[PDB]
Short mmCIF file of C-alpha atoms and ligand atoms in Angstrom, two decimals:
data_model
loop_
_atom_site.label_atom_id
_atom_site.label_comp_id
_atom_site.label_asym_id
_atom_site.label_seq_id
_atom_site.Cartn_x
_atom_site.Cartn_y
_atom_site.Cartn_z
CA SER A 29 -8.56 -24.86 -0.77
CA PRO A 30 -9.39 -21.64 -2.71
CA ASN A 31 -7.95 -18.97 -5.08
CA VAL A 32 -6.61 -15.78 -3.35
CA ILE A 33 -6.58 -12.20 -4.83
CA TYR A 34 -4.65 -9.79 -2.51
CA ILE A 35 -5.44 -6.22 -3.76
CA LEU A 36 -2.98 -3.69 -2.18
CA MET A 37 -3.42 0.05 -3.01
CA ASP A 38 -0.65 2.65 -2.33
CA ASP A 39 -1.12 5.74 -0.02
CA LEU A 40 -4.94 5.09 0.17
CA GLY A 41 -6.03 6.31 3.66
CA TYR A 42 -8.36 4.68 6.29
CA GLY A 43 -11.28 6.97 5.18
CA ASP A 44 -10.63 7.14 1.37
CA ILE A 45 -13.32 4.41 0.66
CA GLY A 46 -17.12 4.92 1.13
CA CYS A 47 -17.53 2.06 3.69
CA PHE A 48 -14.93 3.73 6.04
CA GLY A 49 -16.78 7.10 5.89
CA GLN A 50 -15.59 8.68 2.57
CA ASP A 51 -18.17 11.40 1.56
CA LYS A 52 -16.68 12.76 -1.74
CA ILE A 53 -14.89 9.87 -3.61
CA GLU A 54 -17.30 7.28 -5.17
CA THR A 55 -16.08 3.66 -4.49
CA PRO A 56 -19.23 1.70 -5.54
CA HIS A 57 -17.52 -1.68 -6.42
CA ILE A 58 -15.32 -1.42 -3.24
CA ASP A 59 -18.42 -0.70 -1.01
CA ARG A 60 -20.36 -3.57 -2.77
CA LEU A 61 -17.32 -5.82 -1.88
CA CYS A 62 -17.51 -4.64 1.81
CA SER A 63 -21.30 -5.38 1.88
CA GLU A 64 -20.48 -8.99 0.67
CA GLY A 65 -17.73 -9.70 3.30
CA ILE A 66 -16.01 -8.81 6.63
CA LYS A 67 -14.64 -5.23 7.22
CA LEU A 68 -11.52 -5.14 9.54
CA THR A 69 -11.38 -1.87 11.60
CA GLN A 70 -8.02 -2.42 13.43
CA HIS A 71 -5.83 -3.68 10.50
CA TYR A 72 -2.24 -2.28 10.45
CA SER A 73 0.52 -2.18 7.76
CA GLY A 74 4.16 -3.24 8.45
CA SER A 75 5.34 0.38 7.94
CA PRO A 76 4.05 3.90 7.12
CA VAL A 77 6.01 3.77 3.75
CA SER A 78 5.97 1.30 0.81
CA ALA A 79 9.09 -0.97 0.81
CA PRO A 80 9.10 -2.04 4.51
CA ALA A 81 5.25 -2.38 4.35
CA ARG A 82 5.59 -4.79 1.36
CA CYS A 83 8.64 -6.50 3.03
CA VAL A 84 6.50 -7.27 6.18
CA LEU A 85 3.51 -8.38 3.97
CA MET A 86 5.73 -10.75 1.87
CA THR A 87 8.18 -12.12 4.52
CA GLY A 88 5.64 -12.54 7.41
CA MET A 89 8.15 -10.76 9.76
CA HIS A 90 7.34 -7.44 11.56
CA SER A 91 9.24 -4.13 10.97
CA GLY A 92 11.52 -4.83 14.00
CA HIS A 93 12.72 -8.18 12.46
CA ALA A 94 12.33 -7.50 8.67
CA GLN A 95 15.08 -7.43 5.95
CA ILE A 96 13.91 -3.97 4.64
CA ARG A 97 12.87 -1.24 7.17
CA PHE A 98 12.93 1.98 4.98
CA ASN A 99 12.80 3.10 1.30
CA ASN A 100 16.45 2.40 0.21
CA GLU A 101 17.34 3.66 -3.35
CA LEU A 102 21.03 2.43 -3.11
CA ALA A 103 22.24 5.89 -4.37
CA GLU A 104 25.93 4.64 -4.10
CA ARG A 105 25.33 2.87 -7.51
CA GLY A 106 25.22 6.35 -9.20
CA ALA A 107 22.56 8.76 -10.62
CA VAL A 108 19.54 6.71 -9.34
CA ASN A 109 17.37 9.92 -9.10
CA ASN A 110 17.95 10.78 -12.82
CA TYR A 111 15.19 9.18 -15.01
CA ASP A 112 17.26 9.66 -18.24
CA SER A 113 20.16 7.76 -16.46
CA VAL A 114 17.74 4.99 -15.21
CA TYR A 115 16.24 4.59 -18.76
CA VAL A 116 19.79 3.95 -20.15
CA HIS A 117 21.12 2.02 -17.07
CA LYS A 118 18.84 -0.65 -15.45
CA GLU A 119 21.64 -1.10 -12.80
CA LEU A 120 20.46 2.33 -11.39
CA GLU A 121 16.70 1.30 -11.26
CA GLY A 122 14.66 0.19 -8.20
CA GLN A 123 15.34 -0.47 -4.49
CA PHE A 124 17.35 -2.59 -1.97
CA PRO A 125 16.71 -6.30 -2.76
CA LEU A 126 15.35 -9.20 -0.66
CA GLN A 127 18.01 -11.95 -0.08
CA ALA A 128 17.90 -15.04 -2.39
CA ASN A 129 15.80 -17.95 -0.85
CA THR A 130 13.78 -15.46 1.35
CA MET A 131 10.51 -17.34 2.20
CA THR A 132 7.78 -14.97 0.83
CA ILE A 133 3.97 -15.62 0.74
CA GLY A 134 4.37 -16.04 -3.08
CA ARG A 135 7.00 -18.82 -2.61
CA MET A 136 4.89 -20.43 0.20
CA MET A 137 1.79 -20.53 -2.13
CA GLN A 138 4.09 -21.81 -4.99
CA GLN A 139 5.24 -25.00 -3.10
CA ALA A 140 1.53 -25.22 -2.00
CA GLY A 141 0.76 -25.90 -5.74
CA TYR A 142 -0.53 -22.35 -6.60
CA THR A 143 0.37 -20.52 -9.87
CA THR A 144 1.48 -17.10 -8.46
CA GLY A 145 1.35 -13.62 -10.09
CA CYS A 146 2.10 -10.00 -9.01
CA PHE A 147 0.72 -7.02 -11.07
CA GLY A 148 1.42 -3.28 -10.55
CA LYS A 149 4.48 -2.29 -8.45
CA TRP A 150 7.32 -4.31 -6.76
CA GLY A 151 9.82 -2.14 -4.73
CA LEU A 152 11.67 -5.13 -3.11
CA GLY A 153 14.71 -5.48 -5.45
CA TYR A 154 16.41 -3.79 -8.44
CA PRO A 155 16.40 -5.40 -11.92
CA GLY A 156 19.01 -8.26 -12.02
CA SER A 157 19.30 -8.44 -8.18
CA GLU A 158 18.45 -11.63 -6.19
CA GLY A 159 15.19 -9.87 -5.07
CA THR A 160 13.21 -9.57 -8.39
CA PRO A 161 9.57 -10.80 -8.32
CA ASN A 162 10.37 -13.93 -10.44
CA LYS A 163 13.11 -14.95 -7.90
CA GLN A 164 10.82 -14.25 -4.86
CA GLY A 165 7.92 -16.72 -5.33
CA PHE A 166 6.14 -15.15 -8.39
CA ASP A 167 5.81 -17.32 -11.56
CA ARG A 168 4.44 -14.14 -13.23
CA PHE A 169 5.05 -10.33 -12.82
CA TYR A 170 4.05 -7.20 -14.84
CA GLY A 171 4.50 -3.45 -14.16
CA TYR A 172 6.88 -1.16 -12.20
CA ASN A 173 9.99 -2.80 -10.59
CA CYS A 174 10.88 0.63 -9.16
CA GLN A 175 9.05 2.95 -6.70
CA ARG A 176 10.73 6.01 -8.39
CA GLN A 177 9.43 5.00 -11.89
CA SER A 178 5.76 4.78 -10.68
CA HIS A 179 5.94 8.58 -9.81
CA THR A 180 4.58 8.91 -13.44
CA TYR A 181 1.69 6.79 -14.88
CA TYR A 182 3.16 7.28 -18.44
CA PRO A 183 6.58 5.58 -17.94
CA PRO A 184 8.95 4.85 -20.85
CA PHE A 185 8.86 1.07 -20.02
CA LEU A 186 7.50 -1.54 -17.54
CA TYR A 187 8.58 -5.18 -16.79
CA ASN A 188 7.06 -8.41 -18.16
CA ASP A 189 8.75 -10.80 -15.68
CA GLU A 190 12.55 -10.20 -15.85
CA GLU A 191 12.43 -8.33 -19.26
CA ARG A 192 11.66 -4.62 -19.99
CA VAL A 193 8.77 -3.71 -22.39
CA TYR A 194 9.28 -0.21 -23.92
CA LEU A 195 6.12 1.98 -24.29
CA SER A 196 5.19 4.88 -26.69
CA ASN A 197 5.85 7.34 -23.77
CA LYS A 198 8.71 9.95 -23.79
CA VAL A 199 11.13 9.50 -20.77
CA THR A 200 10.11 12.10 -18.10
CA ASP A 201 11.29 13.22 -14.63
CA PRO A 202 7.99 13.96 -12.79
CA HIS A 203 9.94 15.99 -10.12
CA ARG A 204 11.43 18.25 -12.89
CA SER A 205 8.45 18.79 -15.33
CA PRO A 206 7.10 22.22 -14.25
CA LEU A 207 4.63 24.20 -16.45
CA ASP A 208 6.17 25.74 -19.65
CA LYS A 209 7.42 29.35 -18.98
CA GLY A 210 4.43 31.79 -19.10
CA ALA A 211 1.73 29.09 -19.48
CA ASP A 212 -1.65 30.05 -17.86
CA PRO A 213 -1.78 27.78 -14.74
CA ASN A 214 -5.66 27.95 -14.95
CA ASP A 215 -5.85 26.58 -18.58
CA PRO A 216 -6.23 22.74 -18.71
CA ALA A 217 -4.29 22.96 -22.07
CA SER A 218 -1.10 23.80 -20.04
CA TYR A 219 -1.38 20.29 -18.36
CA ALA A 220 -2.07 18.25 -21.59
CA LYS A 221 1.69 17.34 -21.74
CA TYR A 222 1.25 15.18 -18.54
CA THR A 223 -0.96 12.74 -20.58
CA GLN A 224 0.94 10.48 -23.09
CA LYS A 225 -0.06 7.42 -25.24
CA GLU A 226 -0.13 4.49 -22.69
CA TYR A 227 -1.50 4.83 -19.06
CA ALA A 228 0.34 2.16 -16.93
CA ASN A 229 -2.81 1.19 -14.93
CA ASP A 230 -4.53 0.16 -18.25
CA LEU A 231 -1.63 -2.22 -19.19
CA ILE A 232 -1.18 -3.63 -15.61
CA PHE A 233 -4.95 -4.45 -15.63
CA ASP A 234 -5.08 -6.05 -19.16
CA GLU A 235 -2.17 -8.31 -17.99
CA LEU A 236 -3.75 -9.20 -14.57
CA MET A 237 -7.01 -10.07 -16.46
CA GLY A 238 -4.96 -12.16 -18.98
CA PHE A 239 -3.36 -14.03 -15.98
CA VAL A 240 -6.91 -14.83 -14.62
CA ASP A 241 -8.19 -16.04 -18.07
CA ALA A 242 -4.88 -18.05 -18.33
CA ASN A 243 -5.26 -19.76 -14.89
CA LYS A 244 -9.11 -19.89 -14.43
CA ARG A 245 -9.11 -23.78 -14.22
CA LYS A 246 -6.07 -23.70 -11.81
CA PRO A 247 -5.46 -22.73 -8.14
CA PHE A 248 -3.90 -19.19 -8.32
CA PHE A 249 -2.51 -16.65 -5.77
CA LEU A 250 -2.64 -13.18 -7.46
CA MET A 251 -1.33 -9.96 -5.78
CA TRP A 252 -2.64 -6.68 -7.36
CA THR A 253 0.02 -4.21 -6.02
CA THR A 254 -1.42 -1.16 -7.89
CA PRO A 255 0.58 2.07 -7.48
CA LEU A 256 -2.77 4.03 -7.26
CA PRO A 257 -3.49 6.44 -5.74
CA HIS A 258 0.21 7.40 -5.17
CA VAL A 259 1.06 10.84 -6.74
CA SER A 260 1.60 12.08 -9.42
CA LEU A 261 -2.06 13.06 -10.03
CA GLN A 262 -2.71 11.51 -13.50
CA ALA A 263 -6.11 9.91 -14.41
CA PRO A 264 -8.33 9.47 -17.52
CA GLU A 265 -10.11 12.76 -18.53
CA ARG A 266 -13.54 10.95 -18.33
CA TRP A 267 -13.07 10.29 -14.56
CA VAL A 268 -11.52 13.80 -13.92
CA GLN A 269 -14.47 15.65 -15.60
CA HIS A 270 -16.92 13.52 -13.49
CA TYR A 271 -15.38 15.13 -10.33
CA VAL A 272 -14.87 18.64 -11.89
CA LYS A 273 -18.70 18.66 -12.49
CA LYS A 274 -19.29 17.30 -8.91
CA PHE A 275 -16.71 19.31 -6.82
CA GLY A 276 -16.81 22.35 -9.20
CA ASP A 277 -13.73 24.57 -9.95
CA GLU A 278 -10.56 24.52 -7.70
CA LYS A 279 -7.08 26.17 -7.38
CA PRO A 280 -4.53 24.46 -9.71
CA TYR A 281 -1.53 22.51 -8.26
CA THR A 282 1.77 23.88 -9.76
CA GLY A 283 4.20 21.33 -8.14
CA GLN A 284 4.84 23.25 -4.82
CA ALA A 285 5.21 19.90 -2.91
CA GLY A 286 6.92 17.94 -5.76
CA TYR A 287 5.61 15.51 -8.45
CA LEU A 288 3.72 16.73 -11.58
CA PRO A 289 1.54 19.86 -11.72
CA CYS A 290 -2.25 19.13 -11.89
CA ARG A 291 -5.05 21.60 -12.93
CA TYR A 292 -7.80 19.88 -10.79
CA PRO A 293 -5.92 18.15 -7.91
CA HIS A 294 -9.07 17.16 -5.87
CA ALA A 295 -11.03 15.96 -8.96
CA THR A 296 -7.92 13.99 -10.14
CA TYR A 297 -7.18 12.28 -6.74
CA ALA A 298 -10.88 11.15 -6.76
CA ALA A 299 -10.76 10.11 -10.49
CA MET A 300 -7.68 7.93 -9.65
CA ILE A 301 -9.54 6.01 -6.84
CA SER A 302 -12.85 5.72 -8.85
CA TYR A 303 -10.90 4.54 -11.98
CA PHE A 304 -9.37 1.67 -9.89
CA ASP A 305 -12.76 0.94 -8.20
CA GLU A 306 -14.20 0.43 -11.76
CA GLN A 307 -11.32 -2.01 -12.58
CA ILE A 308 -12.26 -4.08 -9.44
CA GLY A 309 -15.86 -3.95 -10.84
CA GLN A 310 -14.71 -5.70 -14.09
CA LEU A 311 -12.51 -8.26 -12.21
CA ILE A 312 -15.56 -9.37 -10.10
CA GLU A 313 -17.73 -9.54 -13.32
CA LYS A 314 -15.05 -11.88 -14.85
CA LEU A 315 -14.76 -14.07 -11.68
CA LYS A 316 -18.62 -14.49 -11.76
CA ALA A 317 -18.81 -15.12 -15.58
CA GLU A 318 -16.06 -17.84 -15.12
CA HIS A 319 -17.90 -19.20 -11.95
CA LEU A 320 -14.89 -18.41 -9.63
CA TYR A 321 -16.46 -15.84 -7.17
CA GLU A 322 -17.57 -18.74 -4.84
CA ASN A 323 -14.01 -20.34 -4.85
CA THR A 324 -12.04 -16.99 -4.73
CA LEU A 325 -11.17 -15.18 -1.44
CA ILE A 326 -10.26 -11.45 -2.00
CA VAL A 327 -8.33 -9.06 0.34
CA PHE A 328 -8.45 -5.27 -0.37
CA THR A 329 -6.14 -2.94 1.69
CA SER A 330 -3.52 -0.09 1.41
CA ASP A 331 0.30 -0.29 2.07
CA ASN A 332 0.30 2.86 4.34
CA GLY A 333 -1.75 5.93 5.40
CA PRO A 334 -2.51 8.95 3.17
CA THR A 335 0.14 11.48 1.98
CA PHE A 336 0.86 15.25 2.43
CA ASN A 337 2.63 16.13 -0.92
CA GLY A 338 2.26 15.87 -4.76
CA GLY A 339 -0.93 18.03 -4.76
CA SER A 340 -2.75 15.55 -2.42
CA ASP A 341 -5.32 17.13 0.00
CA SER A 342 -5.83 14.37 2.65
CA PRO A 343 -7.51 16.82 5.12
CA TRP A 344 -10.09 17.98 2.45
CA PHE A 345 -11.09 14.30 1.78
CA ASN A 346 -10.53 13.37 5.49
CA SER A 347 -8.44 10.51 3.97
CA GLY A 348 -7.37 9.45 7.54
CA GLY A 349 -11.09 8.81 8.43
CA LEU A 350 -10.97 8.54 12.27
CA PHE A 351 -7.33 9.91 12.24
CA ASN A 352 -5.53 13.18 11.22
CA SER A 353 -3.77 13.12 7.78
CA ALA A 354 -1.73 16.43 7.75
CA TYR A 355 2.12 15.93 7.61
CA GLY A 356 3.20 14.25 10.90
CA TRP A 357 -0.05 12.18 11.35
CA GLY A 358 -0.18 10.04 8.13
CA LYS A 359 2.33 8.46 5.67
CA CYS A 360 5.96 8.39 7.08
CA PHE A 361 4.81 8.39 10.79
CA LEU A 362 3.65 5.70 13.30
CA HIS A 363 0.48 7.68 14.32
CA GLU A 364 -2.68 5.56 13.62
CA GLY A 365 -3.30 7.81 10.54
CA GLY A 366 -0.10 6.37 8.94
CA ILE A 367 -0.05 2.63 9.95
CA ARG A 368 -3.81 1.73 10.22
CA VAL A 369 -5.22 0.89 6.75
CA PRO A 370 -8.76 0.00 5.59
CA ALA A 371 -9.21 -3.80 5.08
CA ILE A 372 -12.04 -5.82 3.38
CA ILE A 373 -12.06 -9.65 2.84
CA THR A 374 -14.71 -11.57 0.80
CA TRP A 375 -15.06 -15.37 0.43
CA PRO A 376 -18.73 -15.88 -0.64
CA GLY A 377 -20.54 -18.63 1.35
CA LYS A 378 -17.59 -18.89 3.85
CA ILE A 379 -17.19 -15.28 5.15
CA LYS A 380 -20.51 -13.69 6.35
CA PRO A 381 -21.57 -10.60 4.31
CA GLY A 382 -22.04 -7.10 5.87
CA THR A 383 -19.99 -8.14 9.00
CA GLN A 384 -17.12 -6.33 10.85
CA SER A 385 -14.27 -7.51 13.19
CA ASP A 386 -12.18 -5.11 15.38
CA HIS A 387 -9.49 -7.87 15.80
CA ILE A 388 -6.00 -6.24 16.06
CA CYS A 389 -4.03 -7.77 13.11
CA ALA A 390 -1.28 -6.67 10.64
CA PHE A 391 0.56 -7.58 7.37
CA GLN A 392 2.74 -10.10 9.37
CA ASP A 393 -0.47 -12.15 9.96
CA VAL A 394 -1.21 -12.49 6.16
CA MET A 395 1.44 -15.30 5.79
CA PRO A 396 0.01 -17.66 8.52
CA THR A 397 -3.62 -16.74 7.48
CA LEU A 398 -2.76 -18.03 3.91
CA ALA A 399 -0.83 -21.08 5.36
CA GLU A 400 -3.91 -22.09 7.47
CA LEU A 401 -6.27 -21.28 4.49
CA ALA A 402 -4.13 -23.50 2.13
CA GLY A 403 -3.77 -26.32 4.75
CA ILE A 404 0.10 -26.09 4.88
CA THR A 405 2.70 -25.98 7.72
CA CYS A 406 3.44 -22.23 8.18
CA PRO A 407 7.10 -21.10 7.78
CA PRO A 408 8.70 -19.18 10.72
CA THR A 409 6.72 -15.90 11.19
CA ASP A 410 5.89 -12.98 13.57
CA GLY A 411 2.27 -13.40 12.27
CA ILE A 412 -0.86 -14.84 13.97
CA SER A 413 -3.47 -16.29 11.50
CA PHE A 414 -6.74 -14.24 11.50
CA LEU A 415 -8.60 -16.94 9.45
CA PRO A 416 -10.61 -17.82 12.64
CA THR A 417 -11.96 -14.17 12.67
CA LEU A 418 -12.79 -14.41 8.90
CA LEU A 419 -14.89 -17.62 9.50
CA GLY A 420 -16.87 -16.18 12.49
CA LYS A 421 -15.18 -18.50 15.12
CA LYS A 422 -13.79 -15.75 17.47
CA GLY A 423 -13.52 -18.61 20.08
CA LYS A 424 -10.29 -19.89 18.35
CA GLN A 425 -8.77 -16.46 17.37
CA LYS A 426 -5.29 -16.08 19.00
CA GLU A 427 -4.48 -12.43 19.97
CA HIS A 428 -1.10 -10.56 19.84
CA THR A 429 0.34 -9.65 23.30
CA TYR A 430 1.34 -6.39 21.47
CA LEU A 431 2.25 -5.03 17.99
CA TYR A 432 5.67 -3.37 17.30
CA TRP A 433 6.60 -0.93 14.47
CA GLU A 434 9.89 0.82 13.62
CA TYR A 435 10.52 3.19 10.67
CA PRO A 436 14.27 3.99 11.05
CA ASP A 437 14.22 6.61 8.21
CA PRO A 438 17.43 8.71 7.97
CA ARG A 439 15.78 12.11 8.95
CA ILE A 440 13.34 11.41 11.88
CA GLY A 441 13.33 7.77 13.20
CA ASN A 442 10.17 6.19 14.71
CA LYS A 443 9.32 3.25 17.07
CA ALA A 444 5.76 2.42 18.32
CA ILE A 445 3.91 -0.23 20.44
CA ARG A 446 0.17 -0.99 20.52
CA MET A 447 -1.06 -3.12 23.50
CA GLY A 448 -4.87 -3.01 23.93
CA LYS A 449 -6.08 0.65 24.07
CA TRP A 450 -2.47 1.80 24.87
CA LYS A 451 -0.40 3.24 21.95
CA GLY A 452 3.18 4.46 22.59
CA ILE A 453 5.30 6.38 19.99
CA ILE A 454 8.99 7.50 20.08
CA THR A 455 9.63 9.93 17.11
CA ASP A 456 12.55 12.36 16.34
CA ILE A 457 14.93 9.45 17.36
CA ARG A 458 17.61 10.73 14.88
CA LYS A 459 17.55 14.14 16.72
CA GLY A 460 18.43 12.07 19.89
CA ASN A 461 14.93 12.03 21.53
CA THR A 462 14.18 8.93 23.74
CA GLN A 463 10.92 10.42 25.27
CA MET A 464 7.77 8.29 24.63
CA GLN A 465 4.29 9.72 23.86
CA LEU A 466 1.44 7.53 25.25
CA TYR A 467 -2.15 7.68 23.85
CA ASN A 468 -5.38 5.97 25.02
CA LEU A 469 -6.98 4.95 21.65
CA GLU A 470 -10.29 4.19 23.49
CA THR A 471 -10.69 7.86 24.77
CA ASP A 472 -8.33 9.58 22.24
CA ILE A 473 -8.48 7.90 18.77
CA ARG A 474 -6.73 10.97 17.14
CA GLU A 475 -3.73 10.69 19.60
CA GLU A 476 -3.99 14.45 20.46
CA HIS A 477 -3.55 14.03 24.28
CA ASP A 478 -0.19 12.55 25.50
CA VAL A 479 -0.67 10.87 28.95
CA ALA A 480 2.83 9.28 29.33
CA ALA A 481 3.53 11.26 32.57
CA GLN A 482 0.31 9.68 34.04
CA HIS A 483 1.41 6.04 33.25
CA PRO A 484 5.18 5.77 33.98
CA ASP A 485 4.53 1.99 34.58
CA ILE A 486 3.13 1.50 30.97
CA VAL A 487 5.94 3.63 29.34
CA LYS A 488 8.55 1.36 31.06
CA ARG A 489 6.75 -1.93 30.03
CA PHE A 490 6.67 -0.47 26.43
CA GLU A 491 10.40 0.61 26.55
CA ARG A 492 11.39 -3.01 27.44
CA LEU A 493 8.98 -4.54 24.80
CA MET A 494 10.61 -2.28 22.11
CA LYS A 495 14.07 -3.81 23.01
CA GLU A 496 12.71 -7.44 22.96
CA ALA A 497 10.66 -6.94 19.73
CA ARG A 498 13.60 -5.83 17.49
CA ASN A 499 16.67 -7.31 15.64
CA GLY A 500 19.79 -5.78 14.01
CA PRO A 501 21.63 -2.50 14.81
CA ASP A 502 19.60 -0.03 16.99
CA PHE A 503 19.17 3.68 15.98
CA1 CA B 601 2.81 3.72 -0.06
#
């Protein structure tokens, strides 16, 4: 029974990595990983935003049954959106917590005899709540507790388990740090203030690598929940200048769509993804040097589809790959562009290299996949193990009747069903819309041609399945 490294990136689109068609952003170590394992082409998140995605991944329940179904900042506590206030008052930090005793994949692997660690970003409970990493199946945690904190990669502090660790970085509000009055928006000098002493991704990595060196002769389950490449656009100058030389000059980003200004927004979005690629490069080198590559299975995926704000340019990178990535089609919506995420798994000598499965699976399935892989009775779950697909024995791969998603955000409100080629969405639910859009993913992968009027029988089946699939108060 092997080691597991579950690498989860943040707002990385279907087509943001070379082996899913990315032309501009170099992902050598990620492509090398693909070439040495199975590429999943119909792998879905729990949600088109972070907290419910990670809730589904951890709990093994789908977005219609899950504890957390939207990004909930608990603003009743006070000035949660003020970074000065959050620096002083940890009671204002982070997001709605998981309940105490919640069976998470971390806790499952723990009572399976695995040393467990999470490194990067949490988002599933505020400091001192019953939902902190260390109380939710993780022996070890390091990085951002809070999704709002990670909006800057030079934060004033991070967490080492339950304790804060203060950094040589001035407290900033990345939503309220415009360019100095009458600074030339075309001079890189005017952006220098968005680079401080300690880049969070450096620290998170040093600590993840320390955890590996610490547990090399032990069975370990390690989740690398990096906040990259979530905006703001901050990356080492080495990696930025690589892409300024490649892409050439470009219009500066001056914060029009929130987060920090950025002189070279394209070059910097690339730099961010290549920087992280290179970290994966060093991890693999260490696994090999410590003779662990053969006994270590590795997942690489993204928590949701690509974004529309913060100086991101998803259309220019075609970050959605097969799917549209403009606002409405990606992050925050149940269009394929937002919920389908690139997925790679390697287990050398067990998984077959250079292979591909189009098996329909999702974050729910990760719990039972790990339970089967670890030889342990699976807790209750909405998941179906996809270990049979990983090991080439399609003959014993159970299939979902259908997949359900709901994102009951306060503004819009979204429910969706996939069942074979048929993909139904109800959006604008908050505005009182009950009308379903129906897409044939086999003839219409970009979901640009509603055919709900032509299949009243399928719409009705889907309407009933949406009622059966879900728990809790409706919206
Ligand atoms: Ca995300």
